[PDB]
Swiss-Prot record, chain A:
Residues 1-132 are lumenal. This is Translocon-associated protein subunit beta. Its main location: endoplasmic reticulum. The lineage of its organism: Eukaryota, Metazoa, Chordata, Craniata, Vertebrata. The chain crosses the membrane at residues 133-152. PANTHER family: TRANSLOCON-ASSOCIATED PROTEIN SUBUNIT BETA, TRANSLOCON-ASSOCIATED PROTEIN, BETA SUBUNIT PRECURSOR TRAP-BETA SIGNAL SEQUENCE RECEPTOR BETA SUBUNIT. It is a single-pass type I membrane protein. Heterotetramer of TRAP-alpha, TRAP-beta, TRAP-delta and TRAP-gamma. Interacts with STING1. Glycans are attached at residues 71, 87. The keyword Signal applies. TRAP proteins are part of a complex whose function is to bind calcium to the ER membrane and thereby regulate the retention of ER resident proteins. Belongs to the TRAP-beta family. GO terms for cellular component: endoplasmic reticulum; endoplasmic reticulum membrane; membrane.
UniProtKB/Swiss-Prot annotation, chain B:
The chain crosses the membrane at residues 12-33, 40-60. Belongs to the TRAP-gamma family. It comes from Homo sapiens. Heterotetramer of TRAP-alpha, TRAP-beta, TRAP-delta and TRAP-gamma. Residues 34-39 are cytoplasmic. The chain holds residues 125 to 185 of 185 of the full protein. This is Translocon-associated protein subunit gamma.
Curated annotation (Swiss-Prot), chain D:
This is Dolichyl-diphosphooligosaccharide--protein glycosyltransferase subunit KCP2. Residues 22-32 are cytoplasmic. Belongs to the KRTCAP2 family. The chain crosses the membrane at residues 4-21, 33-53, 74-106. Component of STT3A-containing oligosaccharyl transferase (OST-A) complex. STT3A-containing complex assembly occurs through the formation of 3 subcomplexes. Subcomplex 1 contains RPN1 and TMEM258, subcomplex 2 contains the STT3A-specific subunits STT3A, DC2/OSTC, and KCP2 as well as the core subunit OST4, and subcomplex 3 contains RPN2, DAD1, and OST48. The OST-A complex can form stable complexes with the Sec61 complex or with both the Sec61 and TRAP complexes. Interacts with PSEN1 and NCSTN; indicative for an association with the gamma-secretase complex. The gene is KRTCAP2. One of its GO terms (biological process) is protein N-linked glycosylation via asparagine. It is found in: Endoplasmic reticulum; Endoplasmic reticulum membrane. It is a multi-pass membrane protein. Pfam families: Keratin_assoc.
Swiss-Prot record, chain E:
It is found in: Endoplasmic reticulum membrane. Residues 143-150 are cytoplasmic. The chain crosses the membrane at residues 122-142. Its main location: endoplasmic reticulum. This is Translocon-associated protein subunit delta. GO terms for cellular component: endomembrane system; endoplasmic reticulum; extracellular exosome; Sec61 translocon complex. Residues 1-121 are lumenal. It comes from Homo sapiens (Human). Keywords: Congenital disorder of glycosylation, Disulfide bond, Endoplasmic reticulum, Isopeptide bond, Membrane, Signal, Transmembrane, Transmembrane helix, Ubl conjugation. Disulfide bonds join 3-34. It is a single-pass type I membrane protein.
Length: 162, 61, 123, 117, 150
């Protein structure tokens, strides 16, 4: 078959879905066919508004034409409002393989099940992930900064030039 | 004279000893032990830095 | 189990056919239902196999449970990821991906979507 | 300063220079000017190493031990040259040249301080 | 139909939390109203010389474009987005493939996205540098000791 072919993917760009924080969802479509996939539409109805808050992005979108050997990236930001097991299912995408061709209905990859934590836990696994060395300085301030600065005030007092 | 010597020695000594111990683990663990399991790295680094630092204490005397 | 004639499969690596050591590599496996019956994709596995002995198992990557229904004429793509071990860098391995799916009639199918010798380069 | 503290200080300065040179070896060799900068660092390593070696000799064998051209001076120069080769071959000429220039003045300094006293 | 005199109200979401997010994602949403009352038109965006098609929404006039770069390349600053219609985008592709001045093609409209820096902490968290500060402090401390012992 030389018609168009679309390999879609739905994945999370967050290690942990934190309650009340932004969660990123990236929908990447790849056109591996020889011809362009005309009239592509992506729909995602698997996120009820009663568990997630759409900070940005639209779940349902369209595309006039996806050139062969080209990929189109769409991203939507939500907000997990409830900690717990939230099943991320497969979104539906419809595209034309050929001009005046039949609609090929497909399903994107499904990440499946994940775990939403609570704010305090988020702090205790990775808050200073790249702040780690700076935090280390703050922890070591009593061990190094305070004694050094305090002594310097003493030395300045008695170390008078003669 | 006793007070000042007792104090300035305490504050500065703690600073220097803390400096050596924290610096040693950083260099040893992240450069010397770059090719070892974290578990062996922790045991060797902590034991080595503290032990060597204690030996340097008597060598100064 | 041999692949059904009515099922087609297209693999595509997200970032190319480079397999850097100690790095995450992600690929997308396509599925076509050209048959008049519903195919149920069970799981997609990955593994490193000896070059001289494709039967020998070196590393078995966990089996992803997909459990997705593919209606007729509809295409289902499934993603999978792993990380090649550091010591495997600079050596070749036989990477065998197998896609499992069963019709409603209980017929088993295991398509060798990709069966080739790939090389993992040290980064 | 005290001889025991002096030996440690010279060793620390030499050790720090050597570690830095290896860490930035690729950058230093990239350009001719950077390689010349390596020459200054190598000579400094030689000067500190020589000071440490004499200090150690004094403590073990008693104060006032005299450093000879061989093997005390030669060994310190050799160690500095070996580090120079690792970054690049080119420094071995420049790295060596700076060490020699420092050595002549250092001997002049030592003669005034010790022989006069 | 090319959108004559486009009117937009751009809004953009930009990542701020690097702790959770693996990669920076820039999102731009524009509610475009055409003077000619056009609807469901092909729109394509060009950012830093990279072409990304613009995704439409089921709602008429709602167009969006997003793209993602790492946290080591998401340097803080302003990023400009240039939009084109189907006709202009056809000329954009030709110009690039012919290595002509891309700026000659006047974009239908432009949108500024501000990125105020994903939070990685202050830039001291480098393993080599951690040793550099440790050793630099240590050398001064040790010299201070030799200053006292003498």
């Amino acid at each position: 078959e030389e018609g168009a072919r679309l390999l879609a993917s739905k994945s999370l760009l967050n290690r942990y879905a934190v309650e009340g924080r932004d969660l990123t969802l990236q929908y990447n479509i790849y056109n591996v066919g020889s011809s362009a996939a005309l009239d592509v539409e992506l729909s995602d109805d698997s996120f009820p508004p009663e568990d997630f808050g759409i900070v940005s992005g639209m779940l349902n979108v369209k595309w006039d034409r996806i050139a062969p050997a080209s990929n189109v990236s769409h991203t939507v930001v939500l907000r997990p409002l409830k900690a717990g097991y939230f099943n991320f299912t497969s979104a539906t995408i419809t595209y034309l393989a050929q001009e005046d061709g039949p609609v090929v209905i497909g399903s994107t990859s499904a990440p499946g099940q994940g775990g939403i934590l609570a704010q305090r836990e988020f702090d205790r696994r990775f808050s200073p992930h790249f702040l780690d060395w700076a935090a280390f300085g703050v922890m070591t301030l009593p061990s190094i900064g305070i004694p050094l600065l305090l002594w310097y005030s003493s030395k300045r007092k008695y170390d008078t030039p003669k | 004279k006793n007070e000042v010597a007792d104090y300035e020695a305490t504050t500065f000594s703690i600073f220097y000893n803390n400096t050596l111990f924290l610096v040693v683990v950083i260099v040893a663990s992240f450069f010397i032990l770059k090719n070892f399991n974290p578990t062996v790295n922790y045991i060797l680094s902590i034991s080595a830095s503290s032990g060597l630092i204690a030996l340097l204490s008597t060598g100064s005397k | 189990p041999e692949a059904s004639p009515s099922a087609d499969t297209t693999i595509l690596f997200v970032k190319g056919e480079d397999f850097p050591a100690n790095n995450i590599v992600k690929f997308l496996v396509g599925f076509t239902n050209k048959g008049t019956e519903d195919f149920i994709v069970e799981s997609l596995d990955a593994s490193f196999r000896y070059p001289q002995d494709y039967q020998f198992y070196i590393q078995n990557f966990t089996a992803l449970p997909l459990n997705t229904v593919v209606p007729p004429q509809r295409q289902a793509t499934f993603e999978y990821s792993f990380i090649p071990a550091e010591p495997m860098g600079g050596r070749p391995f036989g990477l065998v991906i197998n896609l499992n799916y069963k019709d409603l009639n209980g017929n088993v199918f295991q398509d060798a979507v990709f069966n080739q010798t790939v090389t993992v380069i040290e980064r | 300063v005290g001889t025991g503290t002096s030996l440690a200080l010279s060793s620390l300065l030499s050790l720090l220079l050597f570690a830095g040179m290896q860490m930035y070896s690729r950058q230093l060799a990239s350009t001719e000017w950077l390689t010349i900068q390596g020459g200054l660092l190598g000579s400094g390593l030689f000067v500190f190493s020589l000071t440490a070696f004499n200090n150690l000799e004094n403590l073990v064998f008693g104060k006032g031990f005299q450093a000879k051209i061989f093997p005390e001076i030669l060994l310190c120069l050799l160690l500095a040259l070996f580090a120079s080769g690792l970054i690049h071959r080119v420094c071995v000429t420049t790295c060596f040249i700076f060490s020699m220039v420092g050595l002549y003045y250092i001997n002049k300094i030592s003669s005034t301080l010790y022989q006069a006293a | 139909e090319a959108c004559l005199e486009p009117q937009i109200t751009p809004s953009y979401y930009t990542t701020s939390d690097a702790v959770i997010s693996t990669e920076t994602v820039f999102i731009v949403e524009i509610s475009l109203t055409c003077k000619n009352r056009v609807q469901n038109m092909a729109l394509y965006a060009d950012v830093g010389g990279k072409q990304f098609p613009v995704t439409r929404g089921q709602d008429v006039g709602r167009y969006q474009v997003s793209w993602s770069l790492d946290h080591k390349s998401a340097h803080a600053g302003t990023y400009e987005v240039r939009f084109f219609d189907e006709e202009s985008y056809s000329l954009l592709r030709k110009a690039q493939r012919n290595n002509e001045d891309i700026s000659i093609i006047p974009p239908l409209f432009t949108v500024s996205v501000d990125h105020r820096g994903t939070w990685n902490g202050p830039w001291v968290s480098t393993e080599v540098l951690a040793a550099a500060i440790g050793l630099v402090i240590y050398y001064l401390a040790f010299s201070a000791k030799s200053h006292i012992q003498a």
